Design a protein around this nucleic acid. Structure first.
Length: 439
DNA sequence: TTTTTTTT
């Protein structure tokens, strides 16, 4: 923006950066915490880097929604590191895994910028390190105090290697201009180990609910602020577990739209996984991305019907009652109108997984002659998608999403060990621009 | 007990 006029932390981070690029082998990760103004720095690292005449820049982001908002902030285009490292899903019998098909050329990139580096697990990181050549220098940026990478397969503290591995020289971003920042304060105390508390200035700030009536108060304060508003777009209620998140959208939806219904026309919902459209040509399929994971979409035609799923190589048909839901892109992204099959019954889903495992068993060992008709496995499985209602999300899924008012639900947070639960509250708190509430 | 990403 000012070119160089910035915080000492920024001014320095920049100077370190350029010399890591200007000399050979070395790397960098900047730790912006919240309030330290990490984004504007990142913006400046880019604009400046292009005007020095550097051709070799690429912007890599850990996720799709992350890549969207990265590409939007710089104005230059950016893809996922998976796209770059060329990490391609490879199908095995009943499973799927993401491994690196082949190492990309990467002679046209002398500077590799990563965003949200606090999401990198090790399996991904190693591929990364083994890929980038010496003529390239990785500059990561993220928050060591954000929610640590999810790696259920391995037990250990385990923050992203950007903040550990020897090859990276990491500098910290210094605190910014002191203004009235009730939320930034609390969040900076949470980063430092205090639990959430109340600080209110001017009438806006972090406010909790305690005593015998806690949830009733907290909820009655929600439905007053949200009311029948079908715009929750700026009000996000968060929780650790999905069990709680699910309980919430239930209660919340039932009051705002007065119904008992799983889906309602004109409601906005969020894709939990990508939606793929696949055409077969000359027998060999191709697929385009209709909806990225995290895309919000609007319900237009919503009807509850059944389906008879089958698989060649399995006896009979099975009746799976699901929703036929036609849905369009809601947002600043590409507009598609489509229809997905979506199962809500725990009763019905179970019935399906039953089938899903039977055909698996029979293809896993098949001598009928031939090899195995796996095409009828996934074609049949991909028939159904995953979604969640807009109002509430898990702390994990809310990273990077900034809303006017954030509503935080503590009770299930204790299922997380201290280190993480602090990362959760940190993430949770920093989501609200204006107000933050917690029970 | 609990959280979850990713491709032409």
């Amino acid at each position: 923006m000012t070119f160089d006029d910035l915080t000492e932390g920024q001014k320095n981070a920049f100077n370190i950066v350029m010399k890591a690029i200007k000399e050979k082998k070395h790397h960098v990760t900047i730790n912006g915490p919240a309030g330290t103004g990490a984004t504007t720095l990142t913006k400046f690292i880019i604009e400046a880097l292009i005007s020095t005449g550097e051709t070799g820049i690429i912007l890599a982001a850990p996720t799709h929604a992350a890549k969207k908002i990265l590409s939007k902030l710089s104005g230059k285009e950016a893809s996922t590191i998976h796209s770059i490292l060329k990490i391609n899903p490879v199908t095995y019998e009943e499973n799927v895994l993401f491994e690196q098909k082949e190492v990309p050329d990467l002679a046209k990139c002398r500077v590799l910028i990563c965003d949200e580096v606090s999401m990198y697990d090790r399996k991904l990181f190693k591929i990364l390190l083994s890929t980038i050549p010496p003529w390239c220098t990785i500059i990561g940026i993220g928050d060591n105090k954000q929610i640590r990478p999810v790696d259920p397969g391995e037990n250990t503290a385990y923050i992203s290697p950007f903040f550990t591995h020897k090859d990276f020289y990491q500098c910290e971003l210094t605190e910014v201009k002191r203004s009235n920042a009730p939320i930034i304060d609390v969040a900076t105390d949470v980063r430092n180990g205090k639990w959430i508390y109340d600080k209110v200035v001017d009438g806006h700030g972090v406010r909790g609910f305690t005593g015998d009536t806690a949830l009733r108060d907290f909820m009655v304060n929600y439905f007053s602020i949200v009311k029948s508003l079908d715009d929750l777009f700026e009000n996000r209620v968060m929780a650790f577990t999905n069990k709680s998140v699910d309980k919430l959208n239930s209660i919340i939806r039932k009051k705002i739209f007065e119904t008992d219904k799983d889906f309602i026309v004109g409601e906005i919902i969020v894709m939990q996984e990508p939606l793929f459209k696949t055409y077969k040509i000359d027998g060999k399929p191709v697929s385009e991305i209709i909806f990225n994971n995290g895309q919000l979409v609007r319900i237009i035609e919503a009807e509850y019907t059944s389906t008879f799923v089958k698989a060649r190589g399995v006896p009979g048909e099975y009746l799976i009652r699901h929703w036929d839901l036609t849905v369009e892109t809601y947002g600043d992204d590409e507009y598609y109108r489509e229809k997905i099959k979506i199962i809500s019954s725990d009763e019905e889903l179970y019935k399906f997984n039953l089938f899903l495992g039977k055909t698996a068993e029979t293809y896993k060992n098949w001598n009928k002659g031939g090899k195995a008709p796996w095409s009828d496995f996934w074609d049949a499985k991909s028939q159904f998608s995953k979604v969640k209602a807009l109002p509430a999300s898990t702390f994990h899924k809310a990273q990077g999403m900034s809303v006017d008012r954030a509503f935080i639900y503590t009770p299930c947070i204790h299922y997380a060990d201290v280190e993480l639960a602090q990362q959760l509250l940190y993430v949770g708190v920093t989501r609200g621009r204006y107000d933050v509430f917690y029970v």
